[PDB]
Amino acid sequence: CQDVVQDVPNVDVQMLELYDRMSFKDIDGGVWKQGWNIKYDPLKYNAHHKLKVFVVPHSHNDPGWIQTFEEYYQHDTKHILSNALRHLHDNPEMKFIWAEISYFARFYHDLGENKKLQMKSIVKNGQLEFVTGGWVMPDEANSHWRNVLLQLTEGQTWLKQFMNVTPTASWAIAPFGHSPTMPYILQKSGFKNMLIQRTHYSVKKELAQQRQLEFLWRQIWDNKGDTALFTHMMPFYSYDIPHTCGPDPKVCCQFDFKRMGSFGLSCPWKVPPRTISDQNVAARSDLLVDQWKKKAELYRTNVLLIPLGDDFRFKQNTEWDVQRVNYERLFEHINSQAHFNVQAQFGTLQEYFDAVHQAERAGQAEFPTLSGDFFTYADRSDNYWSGYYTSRPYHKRMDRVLMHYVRAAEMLSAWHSWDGMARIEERLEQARRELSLFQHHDGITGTAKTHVVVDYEQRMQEALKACQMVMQQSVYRLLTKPSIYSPDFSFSYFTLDDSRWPGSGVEDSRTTIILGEDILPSKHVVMHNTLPHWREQLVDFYVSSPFVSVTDLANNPVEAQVSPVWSWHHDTLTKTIHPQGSTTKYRIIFKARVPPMGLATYVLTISDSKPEHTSYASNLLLRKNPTSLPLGQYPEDVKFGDPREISLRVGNGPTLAFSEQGLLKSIQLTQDSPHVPVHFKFLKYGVRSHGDRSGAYLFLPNGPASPVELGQPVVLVTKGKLESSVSVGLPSVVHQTIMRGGAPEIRNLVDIGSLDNTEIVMRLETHIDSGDIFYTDLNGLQFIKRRRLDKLPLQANYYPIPSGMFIEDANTRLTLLTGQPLGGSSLASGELEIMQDRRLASDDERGLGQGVLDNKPVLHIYRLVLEKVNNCVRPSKLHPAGYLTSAAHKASQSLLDPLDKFIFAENEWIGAQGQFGGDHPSAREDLDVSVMRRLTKSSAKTQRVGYVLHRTNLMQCGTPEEHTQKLDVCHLLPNVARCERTTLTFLQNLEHLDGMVAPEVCPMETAAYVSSHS
Ligand SMILES: CC(=O)N[C@@H]1[C@@H](O)[C@H](O[C@@H]2O[C@H](CO[C@H]3O[C@H](CO[C@H]4O[C@H](CO)[C@@H](O)[C@H](O)[C@@H]4O)[C@@H](O)[C@H](O[C@H]4O[C@H](CO)[C@@H](O)[C@H](O)[C@@H]4O)[C@@H]3O)[C@@H](O)[C@H](O[C@H]3O[C@H](CO)[C@@H](O)[C@H](O)[C@@H]3O[C@@H]3O[C@H](CO)[C@@H](O)[C@H](O)[C@H]3NC(C)=O)[C@@H]2O)[C@@H](CO)O[C@@H]1O
Ligand SMILES: *[C@@H]1O[C@H](CO)[C@@H](O)[C@H](O)[C@H]1NC(C)=O
Ligand SMILES: [Zn+2]
């Protein structure tokens, strides 16, 4: 395996280094506003060296944005596709590329057989070419790599089945900045080329000047270069026609033949297109070829890409005609006039890349190597697109919840073949497709109209319900004696209990386990562990009595803690935010121990009095002017006091100190160690009163954040043997620090209410000497080194925090792990901050035509890990990556893939079993089975199961960490007949594996395997 820590890769362009060197001056470059006046030598091209030009027609189709998916389909996309089919069929030389398979699949499914065959023919003959072939063109900032892969696989699996094609070129013209997670996944999915567009205008200028817009994009840790993917960055401000023909949009706009008037479009530069005629074709060609030759100056080969399209283009037959006929007249003239030395034609994206590499192999070009990312994007001036790292955070959190439910449903149901009547495949396809759709660059990004956000939410809720159904049917089958198992495939044998979604104070959604002498003495519950190692985790359930005890399914007592159910209320009479306790419902908490990829059953039993193995938390309400807080049968009376500093320790874990406002002030790791200053603070950013306004996309703060005025908040302290917590009702946030013996969990119930033009940030202040360095993750896959740059505005220093961030010095590290993607930064040495929500009155002139005023309460979840790192083997100062410790990685897993909890619905579970998966291998902590998916329906003689295995890289810090078993996924199911290494989409077999043994992957690597079973 490659060493991902100790070898700094040697690349021609390293983005962090480039950022350090660049001046980012925003000067008027002339007609190319953000470039310079391009000059070319007319003698560069001649009879023996022509410029080959590929004009590639396209239509960007958003699967929801200002209309819903279905609205756009009915109003626009179905017409675009119908007319593409007609026009390509009738015009053999015309070409078209298509990206969004969600739309194509819908369209194709609805076609009659005659037209299906016509469609297959224009694909087979190369006129219509699929680019990327994902369900959507995903966001690259907020999306988790697992969901990027999910959506890619959904689109490509459809394409292989129905169109018999698998794209090897990717087209990403629209995401708001670009992540190296894309080439990582694409290169491991058979791709050979990719194209990107939305990168900072200063980066475009810098790379264009050096002819570094085409590069071999490798991962930041990759010393050898085996991850490299050829990447083409487009040079100009937009992917529209005015910004794709060459540097002067006043000229290029004249070659968008939809802009002459009858279509309701015009040219901003006030010179319209004119129909090409015999009397103007020479002058028109002069102008166009001059633009092309200028654009060609920015690249290294004699092969030029000219995209021809825009959003929802090619809708009407007349538009197809007007573009095609005019371009054909230009081609006929240009190609026949030797003096131009140009050969121009309609082409596809693959045709462009094939020609580029032909030129490369002929020895006419060598390409630079590059590592890094392309965040944070700015399209002009100081307009940095860091707002969408946070916009609509409820749905960003929902994404991560659904991500896990899809994984768990696919895994739990994979163990068996299911009858068609069970509707397992149907429900899983629904769930995968809704989650995939949300990866769209107007979905998870929070940049859609309110009614479209509501549509995505409804789709995701349906998907969650589908997952639940599949999960609970699977648990019932896995844990019931086979000769007793009698499934009704519509029945709910278990209900899922989720303690963090939608969350306390967001929705009262969980079911109370109702026990009583005169109703039901006991209840079975089951935990699932999707991770491939034994896991212990505290779990909680609501119960109708505090006198409940827990046993395992050997009837062994399990230590438990009972706590009250606390709900916070904004009291509109007293004008205070204060907690109320239930007098009929209680929380029972205990440690569940669950096999790798397995299930464990426990029993909750009522008694008339305090059980031997159950303890009760104390509760202390700190406020001036307290009133009584009765708790029914709960055996411990609530205590009251004036606000004061408090200190808590659970188990042998850290000791946490809190201010009188209930906010963390210090962490003491051990009994003898220092009280390390770690302060939580809430602040607010505002909006500018002049100039450009923040909106769904842009973050344009009116200076540094100002502290939120806290007043005298009510603080609730719960102290238990297993779990303790401090909660405080702040303006807009109920902030909760939870201690279970390791790194604390932080929960924020964020309700920005009616606070207009406000962004609420949570900041951590420490004395860690981090300087200008911090680390943030990319798509939950890797941690990249960031440098705060004072030459850039505050909003430019904001990055996506899709799963975590950290700061460190020689001795100490503070890591904040997240359960939802949000924006964040380190704006000063020793600080971390992460945006919670934003409510914005104005539009930011990027097309949405609304602000963000549809905020709703959301429960954000985090883990906070303070660690000593003086003993850790870390990358050198010049290495662009960082790596988590074991504790931080496990903390991230606790947020993203918690235990699943099931409550048996009926009174008695006949044939119940105690455990599933006790014999599953417990793999090394850095290895995950990211995907387990049965690929075949029940009628297949040879069953196939697909696995995606990911190994992260954790720092070596002196912990021996011994005794784990080799995980061979190909032997997880019995009767294996073959094992193949495949592309990550499972669509191509790459290696036939000897002994039918799937070898474990290297650090930072991801591999897919398919086992076949007789
Ligand atoms: C529907 C419609 O007809 N809209 C027109 C607006 O487009 C137009 O406003 C201008 O929008 C340009 C961007 O348009 C493209 O993006 C739209 C947004 O959707 C896509 O992006 C969003 C993110 O932004 C993303 O979420 C989503 O998924 C999607 O991918 C899209 O709707 C547009 O397409 C529609 O309209 C065009 C015609 O306009 C049709 O051809 C399409 O088929 C479709 O109906 C486009 O794809 C912005 O670039 C414009 O800003 C420039 O211009 C204004 C002046 O108007 C300046 O103030 C700005 O500074 C900016 O100037 C540019 O600056 C750079 C850098 O200096 C220069 O290099 C460049 O040359 C400058 N351009 C100009 C013109 O000076 C603008 O906001 C308005 C036109 O007034 O009319 C409609 O509302
Ligand atoms: C599918 O494509 C493969 C290779 O691209 C080809 O060999 C095969 O004939 C095709 N099958 C059809 C026509 O469905
Ligand atoms: Zn778009």
What is the DSSP secondary-structure string of 806-872?
EEE-SSEEEEEEESS-EEEE--STTEEEEEEEEEBSS--SSS--S-B-----EEEEEEEEEEE-TTS
Q: HEC profile for 422-465? A: HCHHHHHHHHHHHHHHHCECCCCCCCCCHHHHHHHHHHHHHHHH
Which CATH number is 456's domain given? 1.20.1270.50
Determine which residue's CA is closest to atom 16 belonging to ligand 1: 847
What's the start-to-end Cα distance of the chain, in Å? 33
Experimental method reported for this structure: X-ray
441 lines ligand 1 (CB under 6 A): yes
Determine which residue's CA is closest to atom 68 belonging to ligand 1: 33
- Which among 448, 474, 492 is the end of a domain? 492
Phi and psi, residue 783, nearest 5°: -110, 130
Is 74 found in the same domain as 23? yes
CA angle centred on 68, ends 65 and 72, rounded to 5°: 90
Is 741 found in the same domain as 683? yes
Q: How far is ligand 2, taken at its centre, from the CA of residue 327, in Å?
A: 33
For residue 473, give the nearest of 431, 526, 413, 421 by alpha carbon: 413
For residue 455, give the nearest of 395, 523, 531, 540 by alpha carbon: 395
Is 304 found in the same domain as 156? yes
Question: What ligand has the least distance to the C-alpha of 117?
Answer: 2
Q: Which two tokens stand for residue 24?
A: 């980012």
Asked if residues 132 and 167 have their Cβ atoms less than 8 Å apart, the reply is yes
Task: Choose one of 260, 311, 843 to mutate for the ligand 1 pocket test, by most ligand atoms within 8 angstroms of C-beta.
Answer: 311
Q: How far is ligand 1, taken at its centre, from the CA of residue 54, in Å?
A: 24
Question: What ligand has the least distance to the C-alpha of 99?
Answer: 3
311 lines ligand 1 (CB under 6 A): yes
Q: Which two tokens stand for residue 780?
A: 């939950």
CA angle centred on 169, ends 168 and 173, rounded to 5°: 150
Is 840 found in the same domain as 779? yes
Q: Which two tokens stand for residue 482?
A: 């086979």
- CA gyration radius, the chain: 30
Residue 660 and residue 662: Cα distance in Å, rounded?
5
Residue 619 and residue 630: Cα distance in Å, rounded?
11
Residue 28 and residue 20: Cα distance in Å, rounded?
22
Question: What ligand has the least distance to the C-alpha of 26?
Answer: 1
Residue 304 and residue 355: Cα distance in Å, rounded?
9
List the beta strands (DSSP E) in 457-575.
Answer: 494-497, 522-529, 535-543, 548-552, 557-558, 560-571
- Which among 886, 919, 952 is the end of a domain? 919
Which CATH number is 606's domain given? 2.60.40.1180
879-897 as b/e, with b when 16 or more CB fall inside 10 Å? bbbbbbbbbbbbbbbbbbb
Asked if residues 760 and 705 have their Cβ atoms less than 8 Å apart, the reply is no
Is 978 found in the same domain as 912? no
Q: Which two tokens stand for residue 46?
A: 């001649």
Is 565 found in the same domain as 524? yes
Q: How far is ligand 3, taken at its centre, from the CA of residue 144, in Å?
A: 19
Is 722 found in the same domain as 749? yes
Q: How far is ligand 1, taken at its centre, from the CA of residue 348, in Å?
A: 25
Question: What ligand has the least distance to the C-alpha of 269?
Answer: 1
Which CATH number is 327's domain given? 3.20.110.10
Quick one: angle between helices 393-414 and 886-896, nearest 10? Answer: 90
237 lines ligand 1 (CB under 6 A): yes
With 0-12 / 13-18 / 19 or more C-beta atoms within 10 angstroms meaning exposed / middle / buried, residue 957 is middle
Q: In the chain, how many H helices and how many E strands?
A: 16, 48
Q: Which two tokens stand for residue 800?
A: 């996506």
Distance of CA 625 to the CA centre of its chain: 45
Q: Which amino acid is at 546?
A: P
Determine which residue's CA is closest to atom 34 belonging to ligand 1: 311
Q: Which atom of ligand 1 is nearest to the CA of 846?
A: 24
Is 930 found in the same domain as 856? no
Write out the residue range of the structural domain in which residue 714 sits: 618-897
Sheet with 943-951, side-by-side order of all strands: 927-934, 943-951, 1006-1013, 976-982, 989-992
Residue 544 and residue 902: Cα distance in Å, rounded?
17
Phi and psi, residue 873, nearest 5°: -80, 105
Q: Which atom of ligand 1 is nearest to the CA of 176?
A: 23
Q: Which two tokens stand for residue 305?
A: 């890409």
With 0-12 / 13-18 / 19 or more C-beta atoms within 10 angstroms meaning exposed / middle / buried, residue 576 is middle
Residue keyed to tokens 């009994």 = 671
Helix (H, G, I), strand (E, B) or coil at 326: helix
Q: Which atom of ligand 1 is nearest to the CA of 445?
A: 26
Question: What ligand has the least distance to the C-alpha of 124?
Answer: 2
- Which among 381, 406, 426 is the end of a domain? 381
268 lines ligand 1 (CB under 6 A): yes
Q: How far is ligand 1, taken at its centre, from the CA of residue 359, in Å?
A: 35
Task: Choose one of 37, 310, 442, 444 to mutate for the ligand 1 pocket test, by most ligand atoms within 8 angstroms of C-beta.
Answer: 310
Environment of ion ligand 3 (residues, CB < 5 A): 62, 174
H or E segment at 294?
A: helix 281-296
Residue 364 and residue 67: Cα distance in Å, rounded?
47
Distance of CA 816 to the CA centre of its chain: 17
240 lines ligand 1 (CB under 6 A): yes
Q: Which two tokens stand for residue 460?
A: 């995701």
Category of 773 on φ-ψ map: left (φ > 0), alpha (ψ -120 to 50) or beta? beta
265 lines ligand 1 (CB under 6 A): yes
Total structural domains within the chain = 5
Is 651 found in the same domain as 599? no
Which CATH number is 943's domain given? 2.60.40.1360
236 lines ligand 1 (CB under 6 A): no
Helix (H, G, I), strand (E, B) or coil at 402: helix
Is 233 found in the same domain as 90? yes
Residue 849 and residue 448: Cα distance in Å, rounded?
10
Phi and psi, residue 739, nearest 5°: -120, 125
Q: Which atom of ligand 1 is nearest to the CA of 447?
A: 26
Residue 184 and residue 509: Cα distance in Å, rounded?
39
Determine which residue's CA is closest to atom 81 belonging to ligand 1: 268
Q: What is the dihedral of CA 658, 659, 661, 663, to 10 degrees?
A: -40
For residue 135, give the nearest of 439, 452, 402 by alpha carbon: 439
249 lines ligand 1 (CB under 6 A): yes
Is 147 found in the same domain as 113? yes
Q: How far is ligand 1, taken at its centre, from the CA of residue 240, in Å?
A: 9
Distances (CA, A) of 63 to 100, 137, 375, 440: 8, 9, 24, 7
Resolution (Å units): 1.4
Residue 254 and residue 227: Cα distance in Å, rounded?
41
Distances (CA, A) of 55 to 95, 318, 430, 804: 9, 19, 37, 42
Q: Which two tokens stand for residue 630?
A: 């009765």
Q: How far is ligand 1, taken at its centre, from the CA of residue 312, in Å?
A: 13
Asked if residues 428 and 464 have their Cβ atoms less than 8 Å apart, the reply is no
Is 574 found in the same domain as 644? no
Residue 116 and residue 163: Cα distance in Å, rounded?
10
Q: How far is ligand 2, taken at its centre, from the CA of residue 178, in Å?
A: 34
Which CATH number is 821's domain given? 2.70.98.30
Q: How far is ligand 3, taken at its centre, from the CA of residue 545, in Å?
A: 52
